[PDB]
């Protein structure tokens, strides 16, 4: 289970980074990249992953399926949301809150998409 | 694992836990069991009463095979046979009793600690204790001697 696997990888993981009195988790589907049971993106049955789209416009929201936990090829569903910021945040907010899919990660996913979109804006010096 | 020893923690402490006054000298007090009847008498008398002296008859060329006599108590006597044998006898219609050969199990003497289940049994042994034979008789069993 999630609690069992956490006790295995809480301190021994290829994604774990311990440095400068800080701990980071480099695993995918981890919003905040924090080494935390809550934000870990591998041990849970339901995970939310927000990363930039392949091209530098929009975000891709990743949703783990309840079925096929042991089948990594088909376990994740990738959706590309490419529209204005307010509409993009609303779509993610509905994907989390309305589907009751990991509501603990609502603001985490919104802030991550908010930060990714701001990065995709042209940088002015 | 040397990294977990006190030596690593004692680096920079001068006397290494051995004192500034008494120091760590070579053999203060003698080597081995020196002084057992002298300066180390109290230790020897306190933790090893009986250490010094001769007691008893000495026997040359002791062959421990001769005195080999492993023992099994009564309480663990039924473990020597399969559980099938015990239950089949208890529900047996006629008064047929199973034969338990403790010599086959690797025991020579049957001692009498504990109590037996109330069912007849034929116990074969080289030696029987008095209570062991009494308790076998009480449940309706028999003691058979073998060589």
């Amino acid at each position: 289970s999630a609690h069992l696997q956490w006790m295995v990888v809480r301190n021994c993981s290829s994604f774990l980074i311990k440095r400068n009195k800080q701990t980071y988790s480099t695993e995918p589907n981890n919003l905040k990249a924090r080494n935390s049971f809550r934000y870990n993106g591998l041990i849970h049955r339901k995970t939310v992953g927000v990363e930039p789209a392949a091209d530098g416009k929009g975000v891709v929201v990743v949703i783990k399926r309840r079925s096929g936990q042991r089948k990594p090829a088909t376990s994740y569903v990738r959706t590309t949301i490419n529209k204005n910021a307010r509409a993009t945040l609303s779509s993610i907010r509905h994907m989390i809150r309305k589907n009751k899919y990991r509501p603990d990660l609502r603001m985490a996913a919104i802030r991550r998409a908010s930060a990714i979109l701001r990065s995709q804006k042209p940088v002015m010096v | 694992p040397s990294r977990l020893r006190k030596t690593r923690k004692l680096r920079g402490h001068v006397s290494h836990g051995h004192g500034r006054i008494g120091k760590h000298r070579k053999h203060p007090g003698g080597r081995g069991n020196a002084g057992g009847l002298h300066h180390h008498r109290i230790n020897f008398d306190k933790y090893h009463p009986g250490y010094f002296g001769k007691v008893g008859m000495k026997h040359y060329h002791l062959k421990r095979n001769q005195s080999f006599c492993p023992t099994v108590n009564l309480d663990k006597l039924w473990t020597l046979v399969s559980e099938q044998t015990r239950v089949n006898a208890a529900k047996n219609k006629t008064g047929a009793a199973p034969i338990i050969d403790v010599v086959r199990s690797g025991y020579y003497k049957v001692l009498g600690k504990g109590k037996l289940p109330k069912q007849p049994v034929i116990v074969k042994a080289k030696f029987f204790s008095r209570r062991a034979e009494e308790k076998i008789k009480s449940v309706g069993g028999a003691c058979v001697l073998v060589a």
Partner: protein
């Protein structure tokens, strides 16, 4: 302007001078790196007035500002772009430092990527 931290609390240091080893001035063999004096008569160990001060836990810094650079950020050594990505969701409190051994070719890629993600870099102009 430079990227700003989420908060900029007043940083209080109980002591700014380093703790020098006893008698490290009188000799070159005695480096300044602190060593606890364990001599039986050592007046520094016995804490006589006007002597070398000995580090103790009472000098510990406020936990709210411990490890915080004077800019208000907290350092995080990075070696590549991928290691820079972990600072995306904490770029208001943690800044990046590029490792001393990263090449000038790779360093330019890290710096510009940190510009896009609004991650402050403490050593941006190095090897340029």
């Amino acid at each position: 302007a430079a990227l700003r931290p989420l908060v900029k609390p007043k940083i209080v240091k109980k002591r700014t001078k380093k703790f020098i080893r006893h008698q490290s001035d009188r000799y070159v063999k005695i480096k300044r790196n602190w060593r606890k004096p364990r001599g039986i008569d050592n007046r520094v160990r016995r804490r006589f007035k006007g002597q070398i001060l000995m580090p103790n836990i009472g000098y510990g810094s406020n936990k709210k500002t411990k490890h915080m650079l004077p800019s208000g950020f907290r350092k995080f050594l990075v070696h590549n772009v991928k290691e820079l990505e972990v600072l995306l969701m904490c770029n208001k409190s943690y800044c990046a430092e590029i490792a001393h051994n990263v090449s000038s070719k790779n360093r330019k890629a890290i710096v510009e990527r940190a510009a896009q993600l609004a991650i402050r870099v403490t050593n941006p102009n190095a090897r340029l």
